[PDB]
Amino acid sequence: GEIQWMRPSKEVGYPIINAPSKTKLEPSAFHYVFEGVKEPAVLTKNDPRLKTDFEEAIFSKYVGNKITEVDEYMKEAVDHYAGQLMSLDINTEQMCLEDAMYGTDGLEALDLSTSAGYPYVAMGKKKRDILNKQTRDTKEMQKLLDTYGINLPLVTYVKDELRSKTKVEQGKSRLIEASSLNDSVAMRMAFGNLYAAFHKNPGVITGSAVGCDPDLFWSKIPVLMEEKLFAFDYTGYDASLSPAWFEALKMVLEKIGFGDRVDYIDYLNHSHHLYKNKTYCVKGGMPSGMSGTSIFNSMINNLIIRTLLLKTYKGIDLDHLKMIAYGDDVIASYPHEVDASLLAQSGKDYGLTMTPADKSATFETVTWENVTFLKRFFRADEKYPFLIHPVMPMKEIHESIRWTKDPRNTQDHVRSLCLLAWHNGEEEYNKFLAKIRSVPIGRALDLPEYSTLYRRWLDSFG
RNA sequence: CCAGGUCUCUCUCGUCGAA
RNA sequence: GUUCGACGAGAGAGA
């Protein structure tokens, strides 16, 4: 993805966007108990911690496009993936305005406590001034649809969140692109039946993990993979996507009965963004905050492995490839081992910079012992081998607890951590419970015991 | 005082409804 | 007491 141009807003006719410069993360009563290195990431340009220039570094993700045409491999992959997607047999209908607004079977409601996007943000209007979950009133929305129409500029926000050290002084913060209420609704009316069918079909069929619940679905996964495994990591997936991939996506969309709306995709590689007092244009790159960015990023990953397979292993049957993607994250298998190192090579020739799985330094064979999905390991239960635990290493469960946004929520924060932590096992779980109860409000919490989480975990298959 | 995207899953709270 | 459902708000994690 390339920035095509960028200039002061006041002379493109777009308003100056004012954004907060103070983080909402204060240290917690557990800050000095556990250990960890992550500070809140950089928000403004004057941050005392900075090594480099701010603005220069956060837009650095926009690599520059690489391809423009869909080649014979991409074209091939398209038919296979689309071919595969066909068995799903998924409703091609437009979704009605009421649904796409207020939720329906497979799709939640719009998020009524987040920005409404341009123009509303600057006109002083929140989603709740337009939406009402009780009345379920379209109309006033339909108005603002007819006024402002669609294809509006995104509002670019710095993401308020904890981040490693090397990435703070290096100013490698993350950017949010707030979709306009108007486009979210439009997008959902066009694709909110596609959305629902990926949501209810996570697996090697869709090649997507959206909708799945790792507590349960971790057991279905070994079953679905083939013999030898392969996997990698990406350096800035969303921003490295060249427009040609949007074309391969649209072909797949065309193939399965979405012909009409497939020009909506164009609104994604070509797009306009508002950032404080400037305005800019970007060609390529999937923007953060659109509707469906989760699902589209997955589909394109499914296409990236099929292409890079065909390319690098000349003569290969794609029907024996089982994968699941969650955006750029992915778990992947094959009958015979494949060399992720080769793909990474024959792959920068597509704009994608690939690396080894789990911040490794060398493409090592992928085993059920060192593989991760959604930052969790796989470990079979001692007493019941067929039931797999998703295991998140305590390292960054630690990092999350040393910090809060509102101490009034400490009970809920920590109890969520416990539901993640216990899969490490009774020892480390109680070990953890011990360091929590060693400050006054630690002792006061209401925390479950290993036995209670283990019982319930098992019951949840019954 | 507020400001800060799209989703997915879970948990907690509050409402009405259930022998 | 607790369970169960529907519907609203909060929060955590993951992409």
Numbering used by the authors: 1 to 462
How did the manuscript describe this experimental structure?
The replication of positive-strand RNA viruses relies on virally encoded RNA-dependent RNA polymerases (RdRPs) that are capable of rapid and processive synthesis of the 7–14 kilobase viral genomes. To examine this in further detail and to validate the polymerase–RNA interactions seen in the initial poliovirus EC structures, we here present nine new coxsackievirus, rhinovirus, and poliovirus elongation complex structures at resolutions ranging from 2.1 to 2.9 Å. All the complexes feature an upstream RNA duplex that is pinched between the pinky finger and thumb domains such that the RNA exit channel is opened by ≈4 Å as compared to the polymerase alone structures. All of the complexes show the open conformation for the active site wherein the β-strands of motifs A and C are not hydrogen bonded together to fully form the RMM-fold that is commonly utilized by polymerase active sites.
The original junction in the PV_r5 lattice is interesting because while there is density for the nucleic acid phosphate backbone, the bases themselves are only weakly ordered and appear to be loosely associated in multiple conformations. In fact, the PV_r5 structures shows the downstream template RNA helix rotated by ≈180° such that the 5′ end of the non-template strand sits atop the fingers/thumb domain junction, but again there appear to be no well-defined interactions locking the RNA into this alternate orientation. Consistent with this, the set of PV_r5 structures show the downstream helix rotated by ≈180° such that the 5′ end of the helix is closer to the thumb domain than the fingers domain, but again there are no specific polymerase-RNA interactions that lock the nucleic acid into this particular orientation. However, the PV_r5 and CV_r2 crystal forms continue to diffract and the resulting structures show they accommodate translocation in two different ways that further illustrate the utility and flexibility of the engineered coaxial stacking interactions as a crystallization tool.
